[PDB]
Each structure stands twice: as structure tokens, then as C-alpha cells.
Amino acid sequence: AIERNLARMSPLVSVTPKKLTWEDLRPIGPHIYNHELPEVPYNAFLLMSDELGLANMTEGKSKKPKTLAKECLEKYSTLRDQTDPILIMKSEKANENFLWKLWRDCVNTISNEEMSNELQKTNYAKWATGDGLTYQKIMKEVAIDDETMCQEEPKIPNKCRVAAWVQTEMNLLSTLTSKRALDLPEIGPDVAPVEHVGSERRKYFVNEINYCKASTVMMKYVLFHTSLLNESNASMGKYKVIPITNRVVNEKGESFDMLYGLAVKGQSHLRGDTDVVTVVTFEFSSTDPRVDSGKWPKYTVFRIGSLFVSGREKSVYLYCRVNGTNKIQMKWGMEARRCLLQSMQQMEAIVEQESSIQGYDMTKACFKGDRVNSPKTFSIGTQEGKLVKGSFGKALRVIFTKCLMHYVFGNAQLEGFSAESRRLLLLIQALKDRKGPWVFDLEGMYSGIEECISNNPWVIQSAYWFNEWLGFEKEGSKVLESVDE
Amino acid sequence: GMNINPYFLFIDVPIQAAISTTFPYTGVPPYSHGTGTGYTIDTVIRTHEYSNKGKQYISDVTGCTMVDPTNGPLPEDNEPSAYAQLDCVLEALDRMDEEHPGLFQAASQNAMETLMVTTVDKLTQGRQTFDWTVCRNQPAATALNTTITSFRLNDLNGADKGGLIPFCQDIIDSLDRPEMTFFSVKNIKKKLPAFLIKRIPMKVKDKITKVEYIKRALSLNTMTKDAERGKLKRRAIATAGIQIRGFVLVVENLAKNICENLEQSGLPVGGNEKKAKLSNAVAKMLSNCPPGGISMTVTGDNTKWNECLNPRIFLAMTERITRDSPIWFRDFCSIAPVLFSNKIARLGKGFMITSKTKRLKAQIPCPDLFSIPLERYNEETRAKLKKLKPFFNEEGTASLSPGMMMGMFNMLSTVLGVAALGIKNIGNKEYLWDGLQSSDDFALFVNAKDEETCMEGINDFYRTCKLLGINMSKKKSYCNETGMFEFTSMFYRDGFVSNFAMELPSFGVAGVNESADMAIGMTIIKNNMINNGMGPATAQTAIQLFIADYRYTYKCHRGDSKVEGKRMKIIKELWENTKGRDGLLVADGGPNIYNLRNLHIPEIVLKYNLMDPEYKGRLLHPQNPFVGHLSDYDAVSGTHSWRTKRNRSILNTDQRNMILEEQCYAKCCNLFEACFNSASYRKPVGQHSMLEAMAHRLRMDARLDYESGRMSKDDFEKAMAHLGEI
Amino acid sequence: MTLAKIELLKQLLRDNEAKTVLKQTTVDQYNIIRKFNTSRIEKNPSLRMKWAMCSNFPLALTKGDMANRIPLEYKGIQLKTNKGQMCSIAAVTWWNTYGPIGDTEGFERVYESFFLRKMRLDNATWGRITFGPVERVRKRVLLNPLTKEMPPDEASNVIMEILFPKEAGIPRESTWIHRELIKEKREKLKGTMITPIVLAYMLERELVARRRFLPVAGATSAEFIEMLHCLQGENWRQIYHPGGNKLTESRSQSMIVACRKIIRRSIVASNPLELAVEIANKTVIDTEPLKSCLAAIDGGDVACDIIRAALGLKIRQRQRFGRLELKRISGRGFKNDEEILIGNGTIQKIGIWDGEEEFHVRCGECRGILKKSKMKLEKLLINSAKKEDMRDLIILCMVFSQDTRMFQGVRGEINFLNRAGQLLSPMYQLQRYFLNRSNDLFDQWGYEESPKASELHGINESMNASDYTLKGVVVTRNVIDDFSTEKVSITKNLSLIKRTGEVIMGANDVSELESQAQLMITYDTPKMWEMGTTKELVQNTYQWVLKNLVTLKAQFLLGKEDMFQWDAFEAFESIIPQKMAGQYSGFARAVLKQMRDQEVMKTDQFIKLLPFCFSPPKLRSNGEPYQFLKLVLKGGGENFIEVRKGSPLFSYNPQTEVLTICGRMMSLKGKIEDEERNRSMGNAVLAGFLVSGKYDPDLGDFKTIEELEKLKPGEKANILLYQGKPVKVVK
RNA sequence: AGUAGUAACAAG
RNA sequence: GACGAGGCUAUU
RNA sequence: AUCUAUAAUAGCCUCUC
């Protein structure tokens, strides 16, 4: 029966096999290169590379977030007492007067002798938090009778092009700093030799990750989300000022409490997991928003003062933004430390491979080299169209930053892009291994990839990076086409 | 300057070796919002589009519009097709039977034995189940109890016999009753000023007609799925009722028995067992490659797997498999495909229409979708409703004869895929194909003399699958030389590589309680070390991160820390009062002493010798009030085995009557357990009433106490009087 | 409290809803109404817990005096609600700080298994940690040790007997073996106040086994599975010595595995006896020398006896077939693979033992002498013992004999593969199948007149002596005192010969089945890796070649044949099947010689082929080497080396100059000449063949190995090196 | 507004 | 408002 | 030689555009 049915089945019913070549792999998402679209704006819940933390020496006594914020503001009294705003940039639909009033109310509430962080429900606070904005629910009969009630046209995420600030953020977040933010608790003493090996390797890995800017940003996110969830549960019907705080340790062992800004939590009656609580964030920064204005459509920036870091003083701006979050996002922010694991497990695996090839632990050799082996190096990036190499620790920091960005910019667009581009990556690997891959509908796969590149900054930058790496891989393969031929 | 490109890692590491970095599972999983009606209507429309060239008629039992693509015209293009040919399916099944003698007979006999020794309580083992009495979703046990009670109202007492077979006979008979009486839920609305509307549910008798009951029995309740990774767009899932679930079990058991003995099936094996089987199969295919030839592996997914598979083909499959079985079992196995061929899809909550200027919103339910002009719907919804109209039922449902929206035939769908894999050749051509199947995912190994012959074999396999109603996705499938492939998200590159990312979400605090969560976290770390290639340094870091997450979740920071909190004050007081502080649990502010070598030891046991006697006695108090007690029996678990009172207090709903029935059941069950201490450990058996069993047990206990001196004359007389009065 | 229960039932029966629920709900339907719940269970408990811990009173208190002991407030912290009383986590902390002190007898008893686990960890020694390839196999293994193990149904029946004897139901005969145990347990729990269900799961924890599929490498005993996460990864091994005591069966199995590995390594060496002795003297089974373990245990296999003879010990010719011990008396058997048709109709591949053999058979108490022949059970002389033990011994002897009647007596379902497709020993499966269904075996075997001799009488299928008895079995009154010896001298080739010179055992009788030892085996020698699996050996050999690449290449260019002799290559030779070792050696030597002499040298191919040049060459009758497309190695279908293309064990990327060996990447940068990228691979794939030019269409399709082998010298041929790259070669 | 994204929340 | 199947885990 | 045998609840992972 199968033979008879296949005999009469049309030839048009075909899998249409096509041998894959490097020339068939085109760049993914060409629209990210056309300047008609606006460059993708900054939409992360908090500033990451533009963050500025007011530092106050502590005595290892985590008194209270309110007391910490008050003492930090007391140290920087000029910023605390700045009352007259000089507007620098304004969000399209924001009321800069209301935002400045809310900021001043936050500062006054933090600085008052009272022990509470509650804010009154004033006109500007109500506007900022979005009070009374939910639609009234009416009966089905009246709505059906009412001809003006129509189904809303869904809002689609818009299309954006590559923005250089994502590359800048990647470059800056993966660099080493002088501050440690990780607060890893102790474990039991090592007894088995495998435990001692693990501790010796953790030394290098943590020392590499703990000092990078991405670790400090991740800790800020984790602590803020923890505080926000606690406040949302504890204070459902109150406006609360939640300081954005961190604790860092210098290379000399001295600790600092860092205040990056203040947040205002709106009413939190989150019955559902996707229910939204509005958070109004006021974050200190030194970046002038006008240098690349396309990055800050969502921010209302005032200039509030200046600070001294060296012989040249640096301006201090206040980035003010209305934002929102839900319980799922708060829960997943409290557990962002897992980024570490995903970066560590990968890199450790590589080290283990080398160990199996050498017959001894290769952590020190991989990180810094030894008598018999030169330090292991990875292609890390580009500089003026030429491939640049970096150390093992740099690659570890890059992978950690990538995982942190997966958390920060993660949504359905990133998920779909990751899956489809993973299929494409497997095809490229097949090409590199000289496995002679074949395809059936390559344009369909490319369309599946490109359906997910709309406005996620990480997805757009990932498409750009994928195209760059694919070009480099084509250049490399050009030499593999003339072996025994 | 120098710009970081993370993809450059792949220049040094092969994609498979660094595959974990392509899974962004530290980010928030996508969640669905609002109604799933749009997705359900899209599913209905697409299911009917893939079968529109089939036989369209009207059901004489329900009056629904029915589409039958089976034995329909062969496809003329590469679009998804549901026009499976019965002859080709039977030929594939006969080839499978020839290659595995006695497999169908053994599987059918084992399934029949299991069914004969299966009780009605097997149906309580499900999650949210569609309840026809309330036309809602209720826990599987609740829906089963409601169905049993309603059947009792309609002279249907098969469930008393205890077996699944008499209850399924009762379901079949219920389908024939001219009318149905049952208990349903009715809400009373009260006006509580704030004004708000307060809902008070209660049970009330109700009656429906034969056709309405049949449509409810065949109905599927549709909802939206959340927390799904790797998908840009959301989808709708479906759940069936008790009538369907009764019969799905036997078909699933039969298909599982068949699949377990197929070397080409990836089900029901999973985890390390699946890895071992797959590795063995790949090695076998590698060694079986003809010399001097080419072996090529196709990583493939099937597109529209559930949409295009037809329950009629499944009925044919079941009839073929149970060829040598008694007639009763063949009918029993045929029931489920029949019910699925006549299934009806409930379309969900509906849609929402709003006035932006007036700031108003309203929910139009499914029965009233066409009550408003289609111009008041948005573009996509209007088009979908226009396409849905022919299959729409006036009560708010849709006829869904084609397709497999439920997705309850994973094993049988795998059997069909393996039957496709078992052809291995068309027309004596110079190629041979084999492979592995897991539902819609497959890996196809084709051995031939050159690449072109392998491509011809792949095309032949594609067309053969088309003949069986299976559509290989040309967009998400690819092929290469054997040695590297992907199957069910497992990546083989000269062996299966570890994928650590998929395990990341499990490294958090479980959310049972402090002690259980500590145990779960340590066990997760240990098993990830064993299975997912997690090195010792990463394992220790995972211990540290879990400890940090645990301390912040349970507000049990180190007793020598300066963190603030209601619990932390007492934690610091305990830290001051304690001498052997190394024996304190982490939940009590104690230090963490876990390392790699002791991940498998519970925390209390690990610190047992270090505890101070007073702290140990307080912690392990037999009568601590934080753990439930049986009623006063002693509880050996500590004070950290507490339970959270999960009160699902839906806002503005006052369950003054549902809670009453729940409490009545609880009191009866508690008394029964007090009479029968083994009931919790072993399921009690018996077709007699609980009252009679309890009465006889108490009579025996009283008499034996009297004879043993445990009870005196007066108490014995009282007990006998009460028993006789009862 | 019977009267209290009766009064409670009477009070409950007043409620009409409760009365109707009790009257209409069957005992079976209780299991339904126990799970009745009007509300769905909340999902995502992690988020629910993170949210609830921020609440004020998320914990439920059990009403009673102990809940009342908790103060309403403590230093400005409200611990309990002032319906269902709720408390804060601070209430739990307060109880742990100032609560009443209780007796901890219950916890110590309920979790005794975990305390044994902790003690096993504490009384353990840790060895060194080694870095290197570790090939792991996924096997179904036991997770936790159990003193007594039974299947879940038996354990459940025993637990019901111990804890709920009244409502236990039918006294299943399967519980008989455990009756004594039950009494013992009822002794310990007579006056315990612990809730019975907790005790039941304690007993399950003590009795019911948990078996899971896990990746293991050389240590499958539960004591080692407990520490598996620390034992090894994919690239490192951690020596571990668990505390407690280990069974004799585990020691015997581990020593059998060790001896088989030693023989397999030694046979390919020059003077195998000396190497075998050297390795054996340094072999430790967990924490005891191999020689001592061989001296103590009374058992083993051919390899164990050979190692005993090599060490100067006395050979014990004992064999184990599950339930019975068989001591050789006379005769030598040979195992051959053959497809046997089972009674069910399915042909199964089984190892059949030929020849005539005599065995002292012991099972429980029953003893006997078994005379077996190829595929036939000649005779079995038995002594009177327990009828049950007598019939188990008889059926065990019949199945052990591989008789045709036994195979044809199968009527039902027999699984020779587990759900993962792994091969289960056919003979043990047959033994298990026929143990519980001996009726069909006896019916198929046949019967004949019982012997009428003075001391000989038959036995029937009715487990009693009678005038009818099954063929072959004969009872005797000649009491035998079991087994309580021979003297042999081990020769150079590990063959055991008597004083007469006849060979009684040899290295060719050792089973080739690779198995996972139950106890960790260590070799206290720097060349321990030579006793590893095929993949580990391949990776280590190629790593050694890479480490000495420069000196090896220099010796090759200057020297001619001394480079082919190395101990690393000797270890590599042990994983090559001996049939092809000489042919592979000839092929590889010819290829390397042609690469050198013709000056077209390719480093990747040289490295790939060098290990295969160790065995003495074995050319064809016409004086030319055999030609190969791939060199197959022991174990698995993925263990082979492709001459032309890459292989799962060996692949080379010329673009990046990266060698992938068993999944590990190494760099040839520096140890390579870039000009080798322009060099043609067609000169290093066939012995005696050199690339003559471009692929000529005139010659036709690409020739095969046998077609190449028959070509005359100076003749061209089209060759496909690999996909998309043809070439033509000449001899 | 904002969150967000094919449909919701922005309290009931 | 959150289904089916497979594997693994914890608990009674 | 683990093939057998295996109560219930819950969690995590895998498996339409």
C-alpha cells in the first residue's frame, strides 16, 4: 500500500534537500542595520554601567536601609539639600515637576527622624504610581448594548536598530574593578582532596568574578528585589521609599555602604503573579544623558550636583523613571546569583578537560600559566576589524556578564531568539566540522529567528554579534576549502 | 577600542561543548496574561484548515459539524496535511508486528490484566480536571466524587463495585440516559459597601437533557499555559473530564507496553536510562554502517503534530493492535478514540471589550462572542471569529473532531512514529533508514552509498510520513553526517554532552519548609554533580549560593551577623545563649558545615553530636505545636518541619457551604482512620460501606477489650448499647 | 479508646450529611473522599514561600498546651495571633530558644538509617585524587545499603504484620521467610509512642531498596553509590574507602573483575606471566591486597585461578551460578556463541558450553554430582535432603546444563534486555524464570522408570520419591561430605598445566565480558591507567604520543623500527582484538614508511597510526599489507579509528590544527608544519599507494578495499578520501 | 503614565 | 485560570 | 547476573505560530 500511494503522490510533495554552504548563511535580521528605525532604548530595571553609588564607610553593622540612606545622604549633604532642579532631559509623557516633588519627598522622608519610610498619597505621588488607573468593570449586558465598547487592538513591540550603548555596557560590565559585592557564606572545612581542589579552584574563579562590575550590578539587583518583595507583601496599601543599596568591600578589607538612589513603591495588592506594582526609581549617575540621547527616551534626568573623584570634578545627575514589576520578576531577581553558576560551570568544565590532558590540576596554569604551560587564551572580541585575544579570567567575566544580561533583558523575545539561533548555531558547527550539513527550508529557519528581533536590546545586540562572528567564521573557513584540493 | 563579542567563545569551544551558554534560563520565564480564547480559536481554525479537503458532515448524536480527513486526497504540496491513509498505517503496523512477533499480543494482554486489576481511585491521580456538573475545573478527586454522586442520583452504581471496568460501563450507560440529574454549584451575590460584590456558593440539584450531557462529556476545557521556555508566543492547553480520563488510561497503558519493547522509541525511558539506550542505539547504527558508504543523521521535529494526528487513525491503530484480544477489551480500547473523534472544545473565558475614553472594560464570554458585531472586535479576533463561525456551537463551544488538542496519546503517537521509522526502505532503493522517536521529535539515520542516495532516502521518509499524517518540519529540521545531532533537547557530539543550564531553575529554595528545603537543595547539588557535569568548585559555589538564598528567604542569617528582623532578634539571643554554636541549624542562625562529602546527610543528623542538650531537646520536641499531630502521638521531626496554611482565599468569595462539605468528608475520613490505623499506609479495600466496617471494627475492639480486661462492665454496656442503637 | 471512638461515631451520625456520607461511601471509595478538596493547590511554591515568609503569621499552630506555652508577644514581637491560630517564624525561633526541653528518643530511632549513613562517612579514609579520562557507564545501581532487602510488596506485607497485624488480611506465604524478623521488630516497637505511619516509612527505609540508573566507573556497591558525587567526575577520580563492613560477594566479584583486567593487560605483553605477577602484587581490592583476597575467599573464575597460580597460591576450581556452587572434578568446557530457539519461538544469542564435564554441585544443604555434556544433561546423582532444596538444586542443575529440553520448556515471557536495551545474562534470566515455574520444566523434561537398585531410587515432579522420575536424576544413599584439590604449575603464557602436562586452564578461557567492579579497585603502580577501559586507554596513549611527538618524529626520520616498540603501545595493543592486531600493524607500518620515504609526511595521520604499529606485522600471502577503512577496537560500536575521515575517538581539524581525542581538544600548533595543509592526505591512507593526480572520470567509480588489494603495481584508481574530495592514486 | 506584549494589571 | 506523559527528587 | 517488585501527595526538568 505504501508503494502504491507513493507512486501516485505528487512530486511537488518533497523535502527539497539543499546542501548547505557558507555563502547560504546570510546575516540575521538585516533590519537592525537600517537607520530608519530608532535605536533600541535603555529599558533595564536599574542603571548598570551608568550607576553611581554614594559610598559611606560602615562598621560591619547593617543598621537599617533607612538609616543607611540617611547617613549616606548626610555625608553628601550638597546633593541631599539640592532643592532647585535644573532639568536636563524629560520623558515624553512625564511630569518633571511631579517627579521632582516626589524625589524631594523621598529625600525628606529618608532624612526625617521618624523611623517609617511611608509616603503620603499626594497628587504627584498618585500620578507617579498610577493611582486609580484601572478600568471600571461593568456588566456584560450594558457593554454588549454599548456600541462604543470595542476590543482593544493589541500593542506590538516596535522594531529598533542596533544601539552602541549595549556594546558599551558589555565592555564596561565585564571589566575588573576594585570593589567586592559578593557575600558568599562559608561552607564546611575541606577533608577530601576533591574538596581541597574545589576550594583552590573557587579561589581563582570567585576572585575573577567578585571584582568585576557585573557582580556589583547583580548584587544591587538581588538586594533591591529582595527589599521590594518584602515591602510589597508587608505594605500593600502604602507608598514606601526603598533605598537602592549595596555593600562593597575594598581590597584593604574596609566595607562601604553604597546608595545608588531611592525607589518609591506604589500600592501592592498583587493577587496574581503577573499583577504589576509601579516603582518610581531615582538613580544617581555621572553620565550626561545628552551624550547619546537615544539611550534615554524613558528617563527624566535632572542635574543635582557635583562630586570630587580627582583633580577634575564630575557632575551628578538624577535619572528619574516610572517603572513596574510583578511578583515573578521580584522572585527571579532575588535568585539572580545563579548567573555565577552558569558562568562557573562552563569555565570549570574547560579547566577539567585540560587537567585530563595533563594529569594534574590545571586551574593555575589556565588562569596564569606555569613552568610547562602558557596561560590559556580565548578570542574575546574585535579591535578595528581584527580578532583580539583575552585571558581565561576575561572569558569567565564575559560569560558571567552574558548570563547577567540574560536575566536583566530576558523576556519571550530572548527565549525564542535563543532557541532558533541555537538551531542555526548547530548548523554552523556542522559546517565547521566538515560534516556536510544539508537543509530543507533555510529561509523558514531564518524567518523564525528574525520574528523575535523587535525591541529587546540584548536580542538586537546578539544578532549583531552573531553576524560579526559569522563573518569571521566564513573568513576562517575560506582557508579550510583547499585541503587536498 | 576593543569590543567584546561573546559569540567568539565558539571560536575556541565547539557549540555543543558550550551549549549551556545558549540557554538563557536565569531570565524570567514568559507568562501568559488574560484570556486564552484567541489561542484556542486559532487552534480550532488551524485544525480544520489542515482537514478541510476531507469529508464534512453533521453528527447525528450531538448535531456538531464533523470533518474527517482520513483516506482523503493525497497532498499536492508541502503544507501540513491530516489526510492519513488507513492502508499505509495498517501496512506500517503489520511491518512492526512482523519485526516484533507477539509484541502486540503481549502488550494487549498486559494492558487487559492491568485494567482488570485497576480500581476507580486510579482517576483521582490527576490534576485540575473538567467537571461537567459545574462546567468548571476541579481537582481530579473532587470531579470523580461529584461524578460518582451524580451517577448515584441516576441509578448508576457501578462505582460501588470498585473496579475501573464497571465504572466505565456506567459512563457508557450514562451516555444513553434520556436525562441527567446532578448536583451543581450556584452563587448568591450580596452587595457589601466599600460597592463590592460578595459571592456565596452552595450546592443545588440540577437537570439536563441527553444531548447537553453528551456534549458536556465530550467537552474539553481550554486554558493558557505559563512558564514555558523557548517560545516567542503563548499557547493554549486543554483538559478533559472524568468520562474521557476513564478510558484514556487503558490506551496509554497499551501504548506504553508497546513502546517499552521498541528499540526505536525514546519513551517511556527518561534520564540516565534514556541516555544509555540512545547511546547504545547510536553506537549500533554507527557499527552497522555499510563499509565505504555514508551515514547521515537528520535532526527533526514534526510540525503541527497534534493538529494533524487524527483520532480515527488512533482507533484503527487500537483495533489492529488488539487483534487477538477478547471482544470486550477491544471495545474498551476503542472507546477512547471514539470519544476523542467527537470531542468538543470549550473556548475559554472569552474576550474583553473596553472604552478608553470612558475607562471601562467588560468580559464577553464565549456564548456571547457573536452577540456583538464583528466590527467591534479587533482585526485578528474578527478574522478568527469569521473563520470559526461554521464550527461554532450556540452555547459557546466548537466542534473539534480532527486533531489531538488534548495531547493524551504521547505513547500511541510515538508508536505511530516508530512504525514510520520501521519501513526503512521504499522500492528496494539503495538506502536504509532507521532512527529514534519521541512523540514529535526524531533522529533519522540513513545509510547509503553517497550523499545523493541519502537525500533520496530522506525524501522517501518525508513522503512516507506524509502518508501517515505526520509532517516533518522543513524549517526546524536539518541533517549532517552521522556523529552529531540533537534529540529531545539532548545534544550528541560523539556522545551526549551535559547541559547545565536546564538544571539552573531547580537550584533555588524549594518552598516546602526550612528543613525539607535544605535537604532538597543539598540533594539537587549532589545529583547535579553526579549527572549534569557540575565540578567540585561549582558545587561548593552552589552550596554557598543556596545558603545565601535560604538565609534571605527564611530570615535566618548567621547569629553573629547584624541583620535586623523579628526573627533575627531571637536568633541573636539564641546565639548568645548557645555554647556549641556549631550545632545550631542554619534556620536557627547556626553556621553552614555542608561540603561535597556530606551533601547526602540531613542537617540535623550532621549536627546532632554538636548540639547543646537544651537546644537539641527544644528543637526535637515530640509535642512541638508547629507540626501536626495524630488524634497524642509523638512527632520526631523538629520544629522546622512546620506547614503553611495555604488558604486559597479568593477575594470577595465566602465559601460557607463548600467548606462545610469538605469538613464533613474530613471528619468522616478522620474517624475512619481512627478506626483503621493502617488506612493511611495501605489503601483500604472493600465494597461495603464505611459505616458497617467501622461498626464491626468497634464491636470487635470493645469485645476484645472486655475479654482482656481493658474495659469494665459499665463501659462495655454503654458501648454495646450505642452500637446496637446505631 | 474504643468507647471514645464509639461516642464520636454516634455524635457524627447525628449530622445527616455525615450519616449519608458514611452509608453511601464504600471502603474503596474512602480513598476518593480522603482526597476531596474544593480548591486547587497553588502553583509555584517557591514564589509562594518567598511571599509568605514576608507575611506576619504564615504558620499554623496545633492547638493544645504546647501552643499555649508560646507567649503572645516577646520583647515587642508578636509570635501568635490573638478560626485556626497562626504563628510567626519568630515563634519557632522562640521555641528553639526558650521552649520546653523534650526527650529525643524518637528522632534517634526513626532516622537510624541516616545516622548509619553519617557513621559510614565518618569512619572513611580518602586516598589521592587523580586527573585523567574517566569513562563512565550508566547502570541501574542501588542507592543506599540495606542489611536485609526485599521487593516492595514483601516489605509492605512485613510492615503491615509488624505495625497493623489486625488489619493485615490474608497471610501471604511469601512472608514466611521473614516471620522471625517480624517478631524481632514487634519486640522493639511494643511501647513506642511514635505515629505508626512514620514507623512504617522507617521500616520501608530499612527494607525497601531504591535502585536508579546512574553513571558509574568501577564501584557499584551502595556504600560507593552514596559517595558517587565525590568518587569521580568525567576527568578526575577520588579514591574513597567507606566505613563499615562489606559483603564477601562484593569482594569476590571485585577480585574477579580485577583478575580479568590483569589477564587482559598481561596477555599481549612479552612474558605475560611476569607482568601479571607484577601487576597482581600491586592490586588492592578497596583496602586489601589482591593476593590476600584471593587467599581468603573460596571461589572465583578461571582468571582468579590463573592469578592464584601466578602468585604461588592454590587454585580453587569453584564456580557460582546464582544459587549453587559447582566444583570441577574433570573435563574442560569451551564457550561458543550460538542462536538458540527458545520455547516461546524467539531466537536468542546464548553462550553454549561444549564437552563433557563433571561437577560437585551444592545448593543449600543438598549435594550431588552432575555429569554434563554439550547441550545435554547426561546424569545427576543426588543425596536425599529437603524436598524443596532438592528440587531447586535439580532445576538449577538442569538449567546450568543448557539442555535442549530446558530451552524448549520455556512457555511465557522472558526478558533478556532491560528497558534501556542492555543485555541481561541469558542463563541467569532462564534460571530465574524456571525457578518459580518448575512445573512446565518437569513436564517438558519427561519421565522414566525409577531405578530399582539397592541404593538408587527416583523422584517425581511431586517432590517425593516414587516409581517414576525425570530423566537423568538418580538419588543415592552414598553420603558425600561436600568439597574439601589439584597441583598445577603456571607456564609462561598463563596456562595452567598438571604434572602430566595437560592444560587445565589458559588465558583464552577467560571471559571477555567487561564488567563494573562492586568495590573500588586500585593499582599502586605508575602505569595504573593501562588497566582502564578502551576510551581511557586510547586517550592516554595518544596523549603520550603527543607529549613525545618531537622525539618520536626524530627517531622515525632517523630510526626505522625501534620506534614501534614502547610500553604505551603495548598497553594500547591490549584493546585491539588479537585477530586484527597483526594486520593493523602491517597496514600502519606500511603507511608510515611510505609517508617517510616519499617525504610526503602528515603529522596528524602519523600520530593516528603510530600506536597500531606495535604488534608484529601480518601481511598477505602475496607480500602486501591488508588495507583498511577503519580500525576497530574492543567494546561498543563507537570505538574505532577512521583511516581517512575523523572518528568518535580521533578527529583532526587542519584549519585550527586541533586534535579531538575522545572528546578532549589538544593543539598541534608548534608541533606542526603549515606546509602540511597543502600536503595531500591521499598519500597516507593506503599502503603502497601514492596520489597520481586529479580524479580521472575515465577510471569510473571509486574502488573498494578488496578492489584496491587486487590492483597490479603501477595501476591507477579513483579514491574518495571523504565527501566532496576525490583523488586518484597509483601503486 | 508605566509595566508589558497578540492580553492583561495599574486593587476588589 | 494553570492539562497530559516520561524521568528525577523530597515527604508521609 | 536488578531481571523483578513498587501506596499517596507535592516539587523540578523534558516533550503549536
Ligand SMILES: *O[C@H]1[C@@H](O)[C@H](n2cnc3c(N)ncnc32)O[C@@H]1COP(=O)(O)OP(=O)(O)OP(=O)(O)OC[C@H]1O[C@@H](n2c[n+](C)c3c(=O)[nH]c(N)nc32)[C@H](O)[C@@H]1O
Ligand atoms: O557477574 C558476572 C560474574 O562476575 C559473575 N560470577 C561468575 N563467577 C562468579 C563467581 N565464581 N563468584 C561470584 N560471581 C561470579 O556472574 C557473571 C558472569 O559473567 P561472565 O563471566 O560473562 O559469564 P561466563 O562467560 O563465565 O558464562 P556464564 O554462562 O555467564 O556463566 C558464568 C559462571 O558460570 C560458569 N559456567 C556456567 N556454565 C553452564 C558453565 C559451563 O558449562 N562450563 C564452565 N566451565 N563454566 C560454566 C561460568 O564459567 C562462570 O563460572
Ligand SMILES: [Mg+2]
Ligand atoms: Mg528534533
Ligand SMILES: [Mg+2]
Ligand atoms: Mg519537537
